[PDB]
Symmetry: C3
Subunit: 146 residues, 3 copies
């Protein structure tokens, strides 16, 4: 997946950013079984004051996660995954859940490219990864945290 995470500049330290990325990555892996290295977390920082809620300028505490997924998962699982992102990002960023918005968008795997390759259908990541070249598997496997 690609998780676009919109946050205010300097709201999250380098350590907090690593924690939030790990919370999202672990939630995705844990609930979908997709490999660690396929989860992209992409932080989009903007100055505090660039978020408005009901026309009211906000401080630096809003977090919007825009998750870009393949089609094919159940509403039940998607709901579990959004709730776990809310809960675990709240802990990782030390931020009240009321500040956290989470939207999942879905597209056919056939129009979705990670690491320059077209994605498989959900749940068939094993078939897919076994079909990757040695160099691609090696590059992929370095993008997993200890």
């Amino acid at each position: 997946p690609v998780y676009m995470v919109y946050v205010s500049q300097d709201r999250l330290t380098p350590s907090a950013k690593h924690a939030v990325a790990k919370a999202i990555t672990d939630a995705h892996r844990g609930l979908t079984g997709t490999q660690h290295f396929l989860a992209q977390v992409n932080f989009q920082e903007q100055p505090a004051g660039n978020v408005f809620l009901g026309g009211v300028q906000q401080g630096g505490d809003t977090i919007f996660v825009h998750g870009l997924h393949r089609e094919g998962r159940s509403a039940d699982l998607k709901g579990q995954l959004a709730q776990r992102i809310v809960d675990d990002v709240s802990v990782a960023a030390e931020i009240d859940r009321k500040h956290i918005w989470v939207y999942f968008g879905e597209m056919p795997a056939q129009q979705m490219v990670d690491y320059g390759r077209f994605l498989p259908q959900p749940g068939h990541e094993g078939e897919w990864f076994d079909n990757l070249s040695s160099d691609e598997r090696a590059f992929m496997e370095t993008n997993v945290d200890v």
Copy 2:
């Protein structure tokens, strides 16, 4: 809603950001009935020159509004809303309509969370809000201009 608004840095001063965000917010409430406080307008600024149209580098006037909505509204209503955003952002930003791009994407409400809560189906915002906890209600009601 979440409206991602992609603009060149400083094209909208702080007060113009407020005017643009209030115009989008009012248009969304006016045409859908969704409370003011559910409208998020999230300004994404980039240096001028990062926008290309037909391969040609642009100055600082293009505005792209990417609206993320719940599924469930009619094509007619979404057309009216997109036109009003074009019209009312043109006035708030004092910018030519020909600089304004607006795309709406839709998702099932069941995979959409505002303020840490899953959204209801469209015209159901009232009962949904009433059934939130008292602290949640109080927090969103601060976010009304």
Copy 3:
């Protein structure tokens, strides 16, 4: 289309941004027939270190292209287009293909506005353009490289 291109700050010089924007734009016009000036390439730069893959902080080499399209093209065509974007961005940016991610989202043309006007269905780009006003066509025709 609107192509949001997420890159690290200073990874692409102005020359390389132009080459990347041209590669995507040529790819889209060449496989869809849509006119040049309708392809927006919108570079979103962030400090290197804001991209994580599997929890690991990245350098400045990742590129994510989020293309936002009208509904109605075949999966075959979309696959050809995504692949050409991988290939031609890899050359233009001098970056390995393994660093490049490309997702396409699609939306009904009726909730999609370029240059302040609603888009037509794919393939109808010529008739739509002729119905626009002289000043709208003049503005758009300057956006061809």
